[PDB]
Amino acid sequence: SIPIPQKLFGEVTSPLFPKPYPNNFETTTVITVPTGYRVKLVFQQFDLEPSEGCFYDYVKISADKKSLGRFCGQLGSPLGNPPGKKEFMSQGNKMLLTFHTDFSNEENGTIMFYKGFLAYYQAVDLDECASRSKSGEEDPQPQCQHLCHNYVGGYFCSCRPGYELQEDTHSCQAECSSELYTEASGYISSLEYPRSYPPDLRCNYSIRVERGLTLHLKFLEPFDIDDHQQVHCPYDQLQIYANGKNIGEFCGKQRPPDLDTSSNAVDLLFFTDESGDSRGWKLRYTTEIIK
Amino acid sequence: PTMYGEILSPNYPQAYPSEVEKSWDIEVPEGYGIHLYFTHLDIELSENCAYDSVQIISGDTEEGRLCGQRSSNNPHSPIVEEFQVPYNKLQVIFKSDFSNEERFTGFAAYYVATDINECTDFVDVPCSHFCNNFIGGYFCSCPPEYFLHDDMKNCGVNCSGDVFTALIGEIASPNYPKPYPENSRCEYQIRLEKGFQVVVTLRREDFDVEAADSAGNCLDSLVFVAGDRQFGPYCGHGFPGPLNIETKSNALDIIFQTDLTGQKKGWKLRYHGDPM
Ligand SMILES: *[C@@H]1O[C@H](CO)[C@@H](O[C@@H]2O[C@H](CO)[C@@H](O[C@@H]3O[C@H](CO[C@H]4O[C@H](CO)[C@@H](O)[C@H](O)[C@@H]4O)[C@@H](O)[C@H](O[C@H]4O[C@H](CO)[C@@H](O[C@@H]5O[C@H](CO)[C@H](O[C@@H]6O[C@H](CO)[C@@H](O)[C@H](O)[C@H]6NC(C)=O)[C@H](O)[C@H]5O)[C@H](O)[C@@H]4O)[C@@H]3O)[C@H](O)[C@H]2NC(C)=O)[C@H](O)[C@H]1NC(C)=O
Ligand SMILES: *[C@@H]1O[C@H](CO)[C@@H](O[C@@H]2O[C@H](CO)[C@@H](O[C@@H]3O[C@H](CO)[C@@H](O)[C@H](O)[C@@H]3O)[C@H](O)[C@H]2NC(C)=O)[C@H](O)[C@H]1NC(C)=O
Ligand SMILES: *[C@@H]1O[C@H](CO)[C@@H](O)[C@H](O)[C@H]1NC(C)=O
Ligand SMILES: [Ca+2]
Ligand SMILES: [Ca+2]
Ligand SMILES: [Ca+2]
Ligand SMILES: [Ca+2]
Ligand SMILES: [Ca+2]
Ligand SMILES: [Ca+2]
Ligand code: NA
Ligand code: NA
Ligand code: NA
Questions:
Q1: Backbone angles phi, psi at A23, to 5 degrees
Q2: Domain CATH number, residue B64
Q3: Which residue of B has its CA nearest to A45?
Q4: In terms of domains, do B124 and B181 share one?
């Protein structure tokens, strides 16, 4: 009785309800909630013509592409197949209902009066995240790489620490531009270490300590960057600026030597190629004092 | 005033400034609860979260106080700590002292508005008989041949004039659970098929009628007539008869007599059918 696209809940009654329903009648009413919503519904009253297997009269409720129920009879009699109060949720936003009644509702040569039913339906929000169709989403991209969020109606996504969400709001890039370090000691590592580092990066790991200190840089094992023995660092480069000037462009398999800067300001620039096979690098930076 | 939101520490995901106290006031529309969960937690560790802390206060009460370094253990979920509240407003107060021993990236959290299922989510149910929840509110419903009071909360039945045909149904005294009206004679009629039997159930505690005199005669009385058989008259505080009664009859007449004064809470009952 309330099929409309923009409607939260609603009531669906048998014809002429509460007055008993007429014979030779079959009507299909389809509930439609807006996009991104499931359809819940229950029955308060239920009084139909009973039949073993529901041959005479029935209510046929079907989901998106599957017939969920076909039930008939009265609320309490063991005559067979009453829903009573049971919940019937759909998957999509559409729920197809049908009410069928043949020519004879007067069993056993006497008159009988059957009211009908009272169906209530509410809308629900669906958890887009929990669907989890990891493979087979090429026409849409309804699932995100790091994390999604389930809220009413729609859904939005977000990235791991240190990553930015690009325009599609479905995938993430790395920010890795203003990575600042002002603490006394500290650890600096390539993003997702010791896993393969992302490609096509321009990282500026800036260390700026309080004036009057000298920096000590200690590289950790492993130290894996795509290198080449003919010309060093063709694909990936790890440049190091100290006190405004470059002090070495590193890449390879064995870790660079422990460095003493005599500076309070260093900048580690990280340039990547368009592939990640090597693992990365990690370093501890400490501070010492002067007179 | 949103259905969702993000809360990050200042200068995330870098180190946070010292000597700070930032507050956020979360607000969702009427009839929504709030689910506030933390995707990242890295704060200066102190006993009872003394030095640095993030504080969750709902209205006037402190819903939480968190600190320390913690990351998500489950690879299938990014959540580290979380809270669920039935309120439509929140306050979050993050405070940090003048010093940090190490570099602490702060925290990253998000909130989403959730519907309150007023029927189940609350201890007090604001409906006399039946409750209907919907996204953003609720409304009540009533059994067969019950009429809603203008308060839109409690249901009522008419004292006389209705014909019951349902196999299973409910009947109550007028204004229930409010006191019953005085000087009334209420006759209700239940009519099933000849082959069926009316079996009546009513709870012992849902019965409070003016007590009888010293001689044991009910001043106000309730009485069940099933053709020739008869159960009653019943009166007093508490139903004296059994809770499950089989009448062995398809037609039943319930009669309720009251005088001018000496009223009480009243009664409520519910009947179903059993074949013959
Ligand atoms: C990776 O990240 C690092 C982060 O440090 C980048 O290093 C920076 O490189 C760029 C150059 O590539 C450069 O930054 C700029 O610096 C100029 C000043 O440079 C002048 O120096 C030459 C020397 O001959 C002069 O000839 C020119 O006149 C140059 O202009 C700024 O004007 C730039 O614009 C803004 O910078 C800040 C932000 O508002 C403002 O303040 C200036 O910043 C500089 C530092 O850059 C000064 O430093 C301050 O000095 C006080 C002295 O009391 C000290 O407390 C402390 O050292 C500094 N304090 C503060 C609060 O900055 C002054 O502050 C002032 O001149 C500007 O007014 C303007 O709004 C731009 O900052 C610089 O060499 C470094 N460092 C910084 C911080 O920028 C690196 O470039 C990145 N990698 C890549 C590839 O880009
Ligand atoms: C209790 O049961 C019925 C409930 O159906 C009571 O009837 C009350 O009065 C009339 C009956 O015709 C109905 O509402 C009235 O309808 C007229 C139709 O023109 C309309 O103008 C008014 O708005 C008026 O409300 C309705 O059935 C019901 N109304 C109310 C407010 O209770 C009946 O009085 C009781 N007893 C019996 C034995 O039914
Ligand atoms: C229906 O059932 C009753 C009881 O079994 C029986 O007496 C009656 O004859 C039946 N109706 C018809 C039309 O036979
Ligand atoms: Ca029929
Ligand atoms: Ca959703
Ligand atoms: Ca590479
Ligand atoms: Ca601090
Ligand atoms: Ca609600
Ligand atoms: Ca009385
Ligand atoms: Na790495
Ligand atoms: Na921060
Ligand atoms: Na009462």
A1: -75, 165
A2: 2.60.120.290
A3: B144
A4: no
The closest of A14, A23, A21 to A97, measured between CA atoms, is A14
Chain A CB contacts of B193 under 8 Å are 112
Nearest Cα to Cα of residue B252 among B194, B191, B195, B193: B191
Same domain, residue pair B15 and B97 = yes
How many Å apart are CA A35 and CA A92, to the nearest integer? 8
Domain membership of residue B75 as a residue range:
1-116
Q: What is the largest CA-CA distance in chain A?
A: 114
Given the structure tokens 């059993």, which residue do they identify?
Answer: B274
Q: Would an 8 Å CB–CB cutoff place A182 in contact with chain B?
A: yes
Give chain B's domain count: 3
Residues B111 and B144 in one domain: no
Domains of chain A: 10-125 (2.60.120.290), 129-174 (2.10.25.10), 179-289 (2.60.120.290)
Q: Which of B103, B135, B157 is the last residue of a domain?
A: B157
CATH code for position B137:
2.10.25.10
* Shared-domain flag, residues B272 and B163: yes
Same domain, B76 and B125: no
| Cβ neighbours of residue A238 closer than 8 Å, sequence gap 6 or more | A225, A249, A250, A251, A268, A269, A270, A271, A281
B114 neighbourhood in chain A, CB within 8 Å: 152
Q: Do B123 and B92 sit in the same domain of this protein?
A: no
CB A135 less than 6 A from any atom of ligand 3: no
Q: What letter would DSSP give residue A131?
A: G
Resolution, expressed in angstroms to one decimal:
4.5
Task: Give dist(CA B257, CA B222) in Å, integer.
Answer: 6
On whether both B144 and B228 belong to a single domain, the answer is no
* DSSP-derived secondary structure for chain B: --SEEEEE-TTTTSPPPSSEEEEEEEE--TTEEEEEEEEEEE----GGG-SSEEEEEETTEEEEEE-SEE----TT---SEEEEES-SEEEEEEEE-S--SS---EEEEEEEEEE--HHHHSSS-S-SSEEEEETTEEEEE--TT-EE-TTSS-EE--SS--EE--SSEEEE-TTTTSPPPSS-EEEEEEE--TTEEEEEE--TTSEE-PPP-TTS--SSEEEEEETTEEEEEE-SBS--S-SEEE---SEEEEEEE--SS----EEEEEEEEEE-
What are φ and ψ of residue B47, in 5° steps? -70, 130
Tell me the residue type at B31. Answer: G
| Exp. method | X-ray
Residue A109 CB–ligand 3 contact under 6 Å: yes
